[PDB]
Design a protein around this ligand. Structure first.
Ligand code: 9Y5
Length: 325
């Protein structure tokens, strides 16, 4: 339907429609560009070798499904998806289009700013979690921020992982993301990484030091004996007073962190509960914190061939409906 034009860039090729102009660089690579149909600055990502293997093909499929489903102000939204190919037979390259944002949280703020940024992260997690989706990798690099201070969640790394991910607990839940948020918030109030471990052992040592080693009430819920010994085989440590670690920060912020950085995931506060915490007194509006439509994750359990994952992805591309301007 539209007209495409080839181009070299990032030591890579791009055949995009002609409505996207002025490509400029910025897993797969992202480019800045100008979208003529709406006159917004957009970001265009080209997946690298989307169907090189079964795991890749499934991930490409998973990423398109997730992006096609996200419709919320604090979560990355798909503006367009396209491929140059004319036929499923010819289909080997995938590009995704989103609102360009500029900086990351990666790039010391005031308590008012922190509130607004964490608030928006929780509003987006509430949404994402209502669909049974766990992000798993929230970090400053994955939080895009515009000049207006508006934020969207997008898709070391160990520094923000919940301890039940570090130990490969097979049955972790949604509140792994709340832990990440907890480390992020801390990093914004102190300008310092909360847990800058050097490896999966150092990392945990640092966590336990702040949160204290587990109580017998938590130890009784750990199914792995390796895990258990490894843990029980460590020098007991107590919970520190968060009011003395986060010295002079808002005592409401501190309260919120105590509730996010709990070791036991079963007692960690949720996104929806945190949004009603006092720390967000001035942003919190339960009439404007929506939840998502249900998300069919049934494919996560299937074992298909590359040619099958590739064709389901093609279908998803073809059946894309842009949002309204
Ligand atoms: C990590 C990242 N940055 N990143 C990105 C990089 C710079 C600006 C913006 Cl808005 C996003 C993206 C990504 N991945 S993504 O699935 O959220 C995505 C889809 C489409 C276009 C870019 C991204």
């Amino acid at each position: 339907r539209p007209t495409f034009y080839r181009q070299e860039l990032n030591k890579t090729i791009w055949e995009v429609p002609e409505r996207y102009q002025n490509l400029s660089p910025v897993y797969g690579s992202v480019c800045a560009a100008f979208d003529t149909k709406t006159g917004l600055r957009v970001a265009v990502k080209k997946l690298s070798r989307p169907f090189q293997s079964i795991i890749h093909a499934k991930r490409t499929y998973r990423e398109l499904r997730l992006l096609k489903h996200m419709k919320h102000e604090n979560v990355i939204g798909l503006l367009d998806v396209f491929t140059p190919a004319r036929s499923l037979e010819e289909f080997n390259d995938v590009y995704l289009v989103t609102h360009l944002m500029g900086a990351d949280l990666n790039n010391k703020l005031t308590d008012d700013h922190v509130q607004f940024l964490i608030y928006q992260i929780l509003r987006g997690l509430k949404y994402i979690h209502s669909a049974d989706i766990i992000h798993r990798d929230l970090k400053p690099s994955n939080l895009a921020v515009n000049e207006d201070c508006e934020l969207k969640i997008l898709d070391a790394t160990r520094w923000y992982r919940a301890p039940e991910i570090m130990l490969n607990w097979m049955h972790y839940n949604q509140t792994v993301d709340i832990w990440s948020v907890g480390c992020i918030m801390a990093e914004l109030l102190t300008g310092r990484t909360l847990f800058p471990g050097t490896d999966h052992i150092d990392q945990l040592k640092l966590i336990l030091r702040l949160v204290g080693t587990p109580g017998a009430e938590l130890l009784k819920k750990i199914s792995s004996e390796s895990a258990r010994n490894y843990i029980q085989s460590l020098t007991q440590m107590p919970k520190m007073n968060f009011a003395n670690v986060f010295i002079g920060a808002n005592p409401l912020a501190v309260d919120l962190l105590e509730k996010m950085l709990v070791l036991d995931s079963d007692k960690r506060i949720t996104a929806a509960q945190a949004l009603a915490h006092a720390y967000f007194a001035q942003y919190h509006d339960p009439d404007d914190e929506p939840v998502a439509d249900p998300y069919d994750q049934s494919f996560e359990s299937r074992d298909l061939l590359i040619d099958e994952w590739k064709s389901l992805t093609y279908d998803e591309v073809i059946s894309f409906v842009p949002p309204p301007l």
